Amino acid sequence: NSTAELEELLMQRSLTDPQLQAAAAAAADFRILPDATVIKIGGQSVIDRGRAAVYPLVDEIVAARKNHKLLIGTGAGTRARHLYSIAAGLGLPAGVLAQLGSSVADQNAAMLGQLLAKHGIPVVGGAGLSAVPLSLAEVNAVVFSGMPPYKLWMRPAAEGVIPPYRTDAGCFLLAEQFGCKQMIFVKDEDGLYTANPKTSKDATFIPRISVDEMKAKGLHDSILEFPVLDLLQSAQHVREVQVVNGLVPGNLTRALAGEHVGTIITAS
Amino acid sequence: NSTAELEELLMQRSLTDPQLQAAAAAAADFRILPDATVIKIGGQSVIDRGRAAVYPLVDEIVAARKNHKLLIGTGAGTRARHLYSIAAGLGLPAGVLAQLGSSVADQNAAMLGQLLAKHGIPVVGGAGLSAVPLSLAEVNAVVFSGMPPYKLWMRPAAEGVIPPYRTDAGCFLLAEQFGCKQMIFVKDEDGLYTANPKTSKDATFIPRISVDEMKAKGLHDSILEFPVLDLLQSAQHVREVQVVNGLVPGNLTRALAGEHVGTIITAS
Amino acid sequence: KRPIRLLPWLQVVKIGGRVMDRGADAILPLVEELRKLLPEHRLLILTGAGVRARHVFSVGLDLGLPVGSLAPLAASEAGQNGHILAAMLASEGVSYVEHPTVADQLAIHLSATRAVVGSAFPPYHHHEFPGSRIPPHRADTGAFLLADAFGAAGLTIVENVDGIYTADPNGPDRGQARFLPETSATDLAKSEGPLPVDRALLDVMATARHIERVQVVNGLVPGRLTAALRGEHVGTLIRTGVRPA
Amino acid sequence: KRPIRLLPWLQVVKIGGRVMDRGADAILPLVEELRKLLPEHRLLILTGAGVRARHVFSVGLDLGLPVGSLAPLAASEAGQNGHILAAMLASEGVSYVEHPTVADQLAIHLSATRAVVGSAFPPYHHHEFPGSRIPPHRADTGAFLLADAFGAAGLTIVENVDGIYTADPNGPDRGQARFLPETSATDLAKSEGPLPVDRALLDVMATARHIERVQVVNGLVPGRLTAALRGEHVGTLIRTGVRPA
Amino acid sequence: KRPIRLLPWLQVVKIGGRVMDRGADAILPLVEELRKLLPEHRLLILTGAGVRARHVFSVGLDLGLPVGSLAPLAASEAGQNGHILAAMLASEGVSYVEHPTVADQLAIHLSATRAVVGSAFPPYHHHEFPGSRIPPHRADTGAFLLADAFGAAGLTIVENVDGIYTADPNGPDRGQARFLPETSATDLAKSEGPLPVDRALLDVMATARHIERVQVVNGLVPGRLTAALRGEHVGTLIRTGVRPA
Amino acid sequence: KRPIRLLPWLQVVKIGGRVMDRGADAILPLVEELRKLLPEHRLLILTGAGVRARHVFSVGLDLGLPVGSLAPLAASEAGQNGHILAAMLASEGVSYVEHPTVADQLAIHLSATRAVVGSAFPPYHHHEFPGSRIPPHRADTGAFLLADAFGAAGLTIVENVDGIYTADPNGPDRGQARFLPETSATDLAKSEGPLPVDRALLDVMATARHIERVQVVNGLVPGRLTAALRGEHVGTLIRTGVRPA
Numbered sequence A, B: 001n002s003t004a005e006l007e008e009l010l011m012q013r014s015l016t017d018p019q020l021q022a023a024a025a026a027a028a029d030f031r032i033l034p035d036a037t038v039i040k041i042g043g044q045s046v047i048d049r050g051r052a053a054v055y056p057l058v059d060e061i062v063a064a065r066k067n068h069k070l071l072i073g074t075g076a077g078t079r080a081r082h083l084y085s086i087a088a089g090l091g092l093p094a095g096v097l098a099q100l101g102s103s104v105a106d107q108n109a110a111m112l113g114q115l116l117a118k119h120g121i122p123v124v125g126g127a128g129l130s131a132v133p134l135s136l137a138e139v140n141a142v143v144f145s146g147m148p149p150y151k152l153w154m155r156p157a158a159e160g161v162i163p164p165y166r167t168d169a170g171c172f173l174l175a176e177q178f179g180c181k182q183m184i185f186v187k188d189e190d191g192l193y194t195a196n197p198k199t200s201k202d203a204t205f206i207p208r209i210s211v212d213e214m215k216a217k218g219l220h221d222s223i224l225e226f227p228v229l230d231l232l233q234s235a236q237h238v239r240e241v242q243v244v245n246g247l248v249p250g251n252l253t254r255a256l257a258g259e260h261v262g263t264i265i266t267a268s
Numbered sequence C, D, E, F: 001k002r003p004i005r006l007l008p009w010l011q012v013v014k015i016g017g018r019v020m021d022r023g024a025d026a027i028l029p030l031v032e033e034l035r036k037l038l039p040e041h042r043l044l045i046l047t048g049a050g051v052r053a054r055h056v057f058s059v060g061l062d063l064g065l066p067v068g069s070l071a072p073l074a075a076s077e078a079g080q081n082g083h084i085l086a087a088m089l090a091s092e093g094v095s096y097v098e099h100p101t102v103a104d105q106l107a108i109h110l111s112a113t114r115a116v117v118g119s120a121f122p123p124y125h126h127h128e129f130p131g132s133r134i135p136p137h138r139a140d141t142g143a144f145l146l147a148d149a150f151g152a153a154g155l156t157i158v159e160n161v162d163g164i165y166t167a168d169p170n171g172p173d174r175g176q177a178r179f180l181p182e183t184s185a186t187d188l189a190k191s192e193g194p195l196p197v198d199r200a201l202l203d204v205m206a207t208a209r210h211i212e213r214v215q216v217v218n219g220l221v222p223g224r225l226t227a228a229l230r231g232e233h234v235g236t237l238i239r240t241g242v243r244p245a
Ligand SMILES: Nc1ncnc2c1ncn2[C@@H]1O[C@H](COP(=O)(O)OP(=O)(O)OP(=O)(O)O)[C@@H](O)[C@H]1O
Pocket: B014, B015, C015, C016, C017, C018, C019, C047, C048, C049, C050, C138, C139, C140, C159, C160, C161, C163, C164, C165, C166, C167, C168, C169, C170, C171, C193, C194, C195, C196, C197
């Protein structure tokens, strides 16, 4: 197992060759932004609710950036569901719907960014994310739009044309790519329940669970849907995520302080 | 008068409906950059004059950014008048002339920005203005090109093809949009006079005047032309502007300190 | 004299966002009618925003945002309608193009293909005018500014109603609303009450240099757009007060 | 029902990066064959990456970089192959176009000219999936996602070998490698061992909505691409498991 | 051997900024002549900068700015002349395209339409060469680099004078200025004194691979551009010192 | 060596006269399928004669007329079917062209428009061969002679049956008729019994220089012509016994 042996396989075999795959897996592992936390602010669960949900979270973001480095991604929400409904009724494929959804997450990032601008926190994007390093170094936070960039190359789900990789997946993959220390999803329920809590009671709260236990329990729908949970099981750097209720004052602050509010979902 | 009542009108009526218009007017009013000042550096009145005008103002900008947050926009000036003359003689419409003028204001912003670069002050632009928050937070100043982005969608004047909304209007509208605390136009005369001072004397200096008084006095031409003065009467956040002579050493510094140099023009 | 016409052979068609909001039931017939118009006219098809812009206004106003924040948020929804409509016409060689491309390279794109789709909102961005908390320069206004700047042969506004009435025919006073086959922009600008077109449209018609009339027609009735593009009177004519050369 | 086809008349052709790596000896005959195909088909020609992506993987892995860093670095090399191939076809009106343009304005570009060249890699950028240190969604995978999303008439994969064999015909076990004239993606996905196509290609074939078969042919033999674009069986057919409508 | 020609059928025409500076009196006849050339040639029309670049040089030099600052400021003025000229030809399907588009997608644009307009300045930006405080690689130089890189059929330089003289025919020594019907770049490069073309043009002609001659003609005389594009001798021929293949 | 291909990018499609005889019920779906093929292929669409040629044979034989009299009388009916089909495609730019024009100016007509319609009968007129009282060189034969002379990319024969069977599937022995997915012309020429194609077609396939296979497909099933033009196997393949170059 040498660097010369890896380079020799990389020149002589297909990238599909299991021997090459395994030598590449022994490569060193550099974390690009190891001290940062990725947070997703929900689109339907938070930003679509307006000032009563958003303003307290802006206050928490401003207080947090003193001790914490934050990459803050936005969900899409009800305008994307409207676009998906129109487009799906026309027979358009998942790759066309994917671009429509990104425009809604971009709107939400612009609105959140305008509330944060006087604190120096910018909105960033483009295929390079090139404004992230300097912003994180100087003001300890940046806002980005949460949809992945796949556009027409979006992988479809097994059934239907709704893009399976949306803003939960987009934020998760950025945490995984940057090697961040923590991934927090900010939604509108306290965490995972054995049923979903909006449509049934004696749903029981679950403080901690693995992805395999969620599948084996048959936990369907749920506050995080399965495409992001499968990415989590494959991840190299981010091997658990926390889901918290952003409508509860101070929940994001407390999660960033290491309090176990919400549900922790582990890859294994 | 509720948030639910506004949302109900927004779904059920035309945006032209006076009842919707009035409910929207009762919305809360968020100022995006309330502690910033917008300054316009004149194109024909300052930058076209070269080093003797520009270098002292660069010094004042560098000194000011210690206590003041500045958005510094540039005028266009004599190269834009040349372009307008060529294009108008060909019969081209105001929307074509508008793009020509923006290129000249962009040139002037690049020249000013190069004199400020060693102090860390950047030139910013693009439809998002996305470099403004971090720059203002860290170095307390940014340079931008003063023409509005209307391009081919520029509203024409009642007569002729010269774009009516140029760099005075462009800078003013950014101050109004960001909710800035102050708008200062830096030109080459001490302020407003009862005649314009380059072409007649016993012109009397006017320290303070409302837009209605300017119209009623029949003050025509003038150091600010009427399209920006009408925007001022409609403004929500910036309800007066100050015009100062940037050729006088320290006038910009003194205006930023609250001294009443120049002319103050009030919306009412 | 008045400015020259840049694209005198162009026909501009603005599709209301609320037509798109009806989904396949309205869009499929309209796409079929557009398909049949491609060999007859050179078309710039511009989409408005519709109900999703009302939702983002609701959120942005609840957050306190100013009118220069809300204008590009609504313009985004018109862009999405444009992407949907162009996707349906892709097999005819039709694509959506963005504002910079419409401003500067429309002539070459209309040489490449029979029609292009764009946003009807103008790129006023954070430089929208103050006064109302609702952005004034919306889809009707942007489409007319472009059509008149180009000196196009016409602008047709395709709506979910037959034309202009004396009151909102879907609103509280719908019982006394009577249809107006023809009106002038100056007469409309003197009225109070809602219209199916932006009030700023009437203002830019007063300064217009080329377009003499704009017809508002019901795009939910197959054939009306086709007839309007031939000058047939099938909705409301708005006279702009441009006088012939 | 399944989604509509956006560009049903389109033919997509993916050119392997290792074909380009052979230089003029392989590229000139291939350019001559493409030139003769322009009057027969409407072509989206997509290039893969080849050996330079192996080199940047070698450097990036030695530096410890994650898979979301390596994906755009490899995609860059496919873009460079595309610029080279388009330059050779410039005199026929062919240019290279970037990802945003392929995603949104392909229809107008294929109305302007008979063929365009693009990158076969998808724009997954820093959002590539984790699990392998080698980016999984590469040139075969990107080209198939695009072809199927468009509902194109076909996708042909042009390689430096005759097709798929039971073992790498240039590798250690080349002696027992036997040629497969036809296979199914599900059968290939159950095998272990290297393939001439991305393993993620088999996964996206399982969710495909339109493309029923993909042929892999040897672009080093003049005439095979021409024959494949007419449906003639001259390499390996991969059945996707899309069932006819 | 020499490199291949990318666009051998292209004709490149550089329009001097000072021709544009004369306004409608010079531009309208020239636009009419270009209109009549569109069915005869495939044209890349490139504009120079003219007097406004002198003004921005005056300001930028008074501010002390280096040559890499002044080069893009002058290039901006050539871009504005290009937007003006394209606007006048919009009704013929002609648009202005920017540097990235000229570099990479010219072939598809010339398939879409008969002519495109661009800037004649090259994108040297802050990487302009030092030595003079005046940017050396200006409009004549950029247009020749592009024409020769493309392997175009010709480059014609359209000026406000009949051609090259032995002294500036508008300057102090205008009395002893005699017209040169033909010269070589090497002979011109050995002379001192002003020319109607960039001195860097002579340097890039020495390294040229395809263009054998460039004609400088008076665009204020209707018909001379038309004649030059047919090879008729109506101004000054500059031999580049490329030898035939 | 074999002769060059004159129009190698052409697809030839022969429409059986008995498909046309079914009227709107068969023709409208077929016209819709052809409409969708125009952006995908360059088509020469040739019509056969059908039942009216049987009637004129009945009259002409009762009058005693020789085979050189009956050949142009049948060819007239194929021409009329061609005029009907072209009229249905006129709005797509499609016209019928006569024999002299097909023989000499097809290339320019296929540059003007995506498809043209002609008669599938050859102009043998009073020079038809003797031996049978029924003209031997009919619509299948004429279409194949033209396709092979042009060196076209294919010839597809569109019939009112799935393909060739071992007996007439509409005739007396229809019970023992079994479908033949693939056959050779030489095998068919050795059989006795009726076929859905002219027997002279088998003879001209023996002397053919380019076309290797001809597919016979059911034009009463939407989609089969589309699939056949992509090389998909959906009817009977006839191998001609041309060997690849
Ligand atoms: N006087 C009037 N006459 C006709 N319609 C009116 C009038 N007043 C209000 N309306 C309303 O205007 C509605 C159209 O709503 P709106 O005009 O905003 O939609 P749109 O034009 O499709 O949206 P967009 O402006 O984003 O394209 C009509 O359905 C009608 O109810």
